[PDB]
Design a protein around this ligand. Structure first.
Ligand SMILES: CC(C)[C@H](N)C(=O)OCCOCn1cnc2c(=O)[nH]c(N)nc21
Length: 488
């Protein structure tokens, strides 16, 4: 049995093994969102300043390409746990890969060590991020109503890592010792691994040690042919372009652009088709299409506060926090800590707003429209500030006020799109619907990987006013069809 092997208690009233993976996902997401927050500055900083010296636009662009691939790679890694390794194996493999990628940035490998890092982390992330989340659900038996808060606590380490690590890592940016910071994250990740190795056998029991739908003899051949070849075609066209000096990041940034727009369509096409989706569950899939837009428009802006907003604040504002007499230097890595901090504070409190309303709750597109409008309004804010002040160095107060408006928008849109991801998924294409909602984050990130090239031609300020406006315009449009979508 799956639930007879594992302790049903031991961690704030939940199964002991939720204590094991909290400590694992904490030390992973800590070193991820830490690395993720130096990395931008390790790229477009000058060589004398220990950086690498990459074009400001290639560096902003890597950031969104790197991001999107973290989330696309959850799709084959959900698969490899499903057909070859099982959830446990994939997570262990994923973790060991990640630590390799962090160690790479610690070594002085300049442009090679950067991408080998991206390679090793992206790989392990898809084997770990989605399959660690699988194992936590499988710890609760079929009719166990604890599973709900058990995921709230799990994702609480997610925000705890992502809160604490920009804080700590801020010093290695000031003393411009990038290598040393990537080593801290690197260790921090190993802590998680050691802890899993030491205590995974006894708290997780036998869960996910075997794959669910393993591959038959002929499937091992078919798939190992197909997958084998694409790996070859890819390798070659990289090899070919490196040694003919054709290769830049426009190859990668355009590929992913393509995937990020291709992959949502396939999923809705293979979904809306098939006679396995009744007339009830269909049309509802046509009703998530609009929501998928509003989730794409939203995460566009949100995930840009990791490569666009924070550069703008470092270069265009006084970087001096200034609240009711409390002034201090606002460290630039500290921008990536607002977004989790307000989640950790106000995830429980936007939970009461919807519970005290019961049925007069906002609809579902209503949330999705609220949270896209705000993110939209948030880019209109910072654009207008820059437009008012012009050349004069304004307060970093304003740059923070954008981040906040955005994270308040997410409070309506993050808890709803994943409540609704695998809520009304077709009672056959459930995972296929998990993969949809997640792509709201991956497509935004592949669109951003190319969207940022409009900064030079439109100017840093006007950029901000164009994006905020497509968000609000296109949101209001969909809001007129907001009763038809609600019929579901
Ligand atoms: C900048 C970051 C701190 C960012 N706001 C953040 O908290 O990212 C969380 C990492 O993404 C995974 N994740 C977090 N919450 C959820 C969630 O609620 N559902 C799913 N499927 N994935 C989630």
């Amino acid at each position: 049995q799956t639930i007879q092997s594992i302790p049903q208690k031991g961690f704030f009233g939940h199964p002991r093994g939720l204590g094991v993976l909290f400590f694992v996902e904490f030390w992973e997401r800590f070193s991820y969102y830490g690395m993720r927050a130096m990395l931008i500055f390790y790229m477009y900083f000058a060589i004398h300043q220990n950086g690498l010296g990459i074009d400001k636009t290639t560096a902003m662009s890597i950031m969104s390409v790197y991001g999107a691939l973290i989330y696309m790679s959850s799709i084959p890694g959900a698969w490899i746990a499903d057909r070859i390794t099982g959830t446990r194996g994939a997570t262990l493999l994923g973790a060991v890969l990640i630590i390799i990628g962090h160690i790479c940035l610690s070594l002085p490998f300049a442009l090679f060590g950067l991408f080998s890092s991206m390679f090793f982390i992206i790989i392990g992330s898809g084997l770990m991020k989605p399959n660690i989340s699988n194992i936590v659900g499988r710890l609760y038996p079929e009719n166990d109503t604890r599973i709900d808060a058990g995921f709230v606590i799990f994702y609480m380490s997610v925000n705890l890592g992502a809160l604490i690590s920009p804080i700590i890592l801020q010093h290695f940016v000031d003393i411009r010792n990038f290598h040393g910071g990537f080593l801290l994250a690197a260790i921090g990740m190993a802590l998680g691994l050691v802890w899993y190795l030491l205590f995974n056998r006894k708290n997780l029991g036998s869960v996910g040690m075997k794959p669910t739908n393993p591959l038959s003899k002929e499937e091992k051949r078919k798939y190992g042919m197909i997958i084998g070849i694409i790996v070859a075609i890819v390798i070659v066209v990289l090899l070919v372009t490196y040694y003919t000096h054709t290769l830049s990041f426009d190859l990668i940034s355009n590929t992913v652009l393509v995937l990020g727009v291709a992959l949502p369509i396939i999923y809705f096409t293979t979904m809306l088709r098939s006679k396995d989706v009744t007339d009830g569950e269909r049309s509802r899939v046509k009703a998530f299409i609009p929501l998928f837009i509003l989730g794409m428009l939203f995460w566009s802006i949100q995930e840009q506060g990791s490569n666009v907003l924070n550069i703008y604040g470092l270069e265009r504002s006084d970087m001096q926090l200034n609240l009711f007499g409390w002034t201090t230097r606002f460290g630039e890595a500290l921008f990536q800590s607002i977004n989790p901090l307000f989640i950790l504070l106000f995830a429980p409190v936007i939970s009461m707003i919807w519970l005290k309303m019961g049925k007069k709750q906002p609809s579902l597109a209503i949330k999705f429209s609220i949270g896209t409008l705000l993110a939209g309004l948030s880019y209109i804010l910072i654009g207008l500030v820059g437009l008012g002040y012009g050349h004069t160095q304004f307060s970093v107060n304003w740059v923070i006020l954008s981040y906040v408006i955005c994270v308040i928008g997410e409070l309506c849109l993050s808890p709803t799109g994943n409540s609704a991801a695998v809520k009304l998924a077709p009672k056959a294409f459930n995972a296929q619907m998990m993969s949809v909602w997640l792509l709201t984050n991956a497509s935004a990130q592949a669109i951003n990987g190319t969207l940022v090239k409009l900064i030079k031609p439109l100017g840093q300020t006007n950029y901000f006013i164009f994006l905020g406006t497509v968000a609000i315009v296109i949101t209001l449009i969909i809001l007129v069809f907001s009763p038809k979508i609600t019929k579901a």
